[PDB]
Each structure stands twice: as C-alpha cells, then as structure tokens.
Design a binder for these strands. Structure first.
Ligand code: CA
Ligand code: ZN
Ligand code: ZN
Length: 59
DNA sequence: TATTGCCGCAG
DNA sequence: ACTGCGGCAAT
C-alpha cells in the first residue's frame, strides 16, 4: 500500500517510479511521439498506437 | 535509479 | 468515441 514516489511540484504519490515518470512528463508537456496521420502528440508509442483507430472509417 | 508495452479504470 | 491516467512487468 506504500506510495513512496512523489512529485516535487504537487506532491502526488505513486506506487512505483513509472507512474511518477509519466506524471512529471505530463507537467512538462513532454509528448515526443506523434501520430503520423494527424500529427497529434502523445507520451509514448503505445498511446499513439491506441489513438490510431480515430482514423478508421466508422461503421 | 531510468523508460515503455500492455492493460484496465474512469470520465 | 477518445484519452488522461498509472500499476505491473520487463528491460
Ligand atoms: Ca489502474
Ligand atoms: Zn505533480
Ligand atoms: Zn492521429
């Protein structure tokens, strides 16, 4: 139940370093991976990949 | 100590 | 529909 990782600007706590890494980068606006179709930026390639289905033609 | 893929939760 | 989020496992 321990959440020993925390943000130095707002104090939000995390179970492990990954949640903190992502949270810090979200404060920074660090979104280095982009959708090749529309240019929208995301934190990582997994998030880009999940976004791609926006560009399918809807049923 | 670090980063992301996968995954589920929630709005 | 779309995506912000974050725990876990792996690296
Ligand atoms: Ca969760
Ligand atoms: Zn914070
Ligand atoms: Zn796109």
């Amino acid at each position: 139940s321990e959440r020993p990782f925390f943000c130095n600007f707002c104090g939000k706590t995390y179970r492990d370093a990954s949640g903190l890494s992502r949270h810090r980068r979200a404060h920074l606006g660090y979104r280095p991976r982009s959708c090749p179709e529309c240019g929208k930026c995301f934190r990582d390639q997994s998030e880009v990949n999940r976004h791609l289905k926006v560009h399918q033609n809807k049923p």
